[PDB]
């Protein structure tokens, strides 16, 4: 129930503000995946957790952007 956050327009997302604990990625997940969802910056952009099992996520080991 996890993955890399897919964009509204661009496929891949834009880059993150802060590594470690932050609000910047958590708000960015909660507006795609519902208010109970979690998230963190994986290295470059926001990754999300505690998702619904039918949720859509970007294929980071098949496509590269960040």
UniProtKB/Swiss-Prot annotation:
Has the structural arrangement of an alpha-helix connected to antiparallel beta-sheets by disulfide bonds (CS-alpha/beta). Pfam families: Toxin_3 (PF00537). Expressed by the venom gland. Its main location: secreted. GO terms for cellular component: extracellular space. C-terminal amidation increases its affinity for sodium channels. Keywords: Amidation, Disulfide bond, Ion channel impairing toxin, Neurotoxin, Secreted, Toxin, Voltage-gated sodium channel impairing toxin. Beta toxin that binds site-4 of sodium channels (Nav) and reduces peak current (observed on Nav1.6/SCN8A (IC(50)=307 nM)), shifts the voltage of activation toward more negative potentials (observed on Nav1.6, Nav1.1 (weak), Nav1.2 (weak), and Nav1.7 (weak)), and induces resurgent currents at negative voltages following brief and strong depolarizations (observed on Nav1.6, Nav1.1 (weak), and Nav1.7 (weak)). A reduction of peak current of Nav1.5/SCN7A has been observed in another study (IC(50)=35-40 nM). This toxin is only active on mammals. It has been shown to bind phospholipids. Residues 1-66 form the LCN-type CS-alpha/beta domain. InterPro entries: LCN-type_CS_alpha_beta_dom, Scorpion_toxin-like, Scorpion_toxin-like_sf, Scorpion_toxinL, Scorpion_toxinL/defensin. It comes from Centruroides suffusus (Durango bark scorpion). Transmembrane segments: none annotated. Belongs to the long (4 C-C) scorpion toxin superfamily. Sodium channel inhibitor family. Beta subfamily. This is Beta-mammal toxin Css2. The lineage of its organism: Eukaryota, Metazoa, Ecdysozoa, Arthropoda, Chelicerata. The modification Asparagine amide is found at residue 66.
């Amino acid at each position: 129930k996890e993955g890399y956050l897919v964009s509204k327009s661009t496929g891949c997302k834009y880059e993150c503000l802060k590594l470690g604990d932050n609000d910047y990625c958590l708000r960015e997940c909660k507006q795609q995946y519902g208010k109970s969802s979690g998230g963190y910056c994986y290295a470059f952009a926001c990754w999300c957790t505690h998702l619904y099992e039918q949720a859509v996520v970007w294929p980071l080991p098949n496509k590269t952007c960040n």
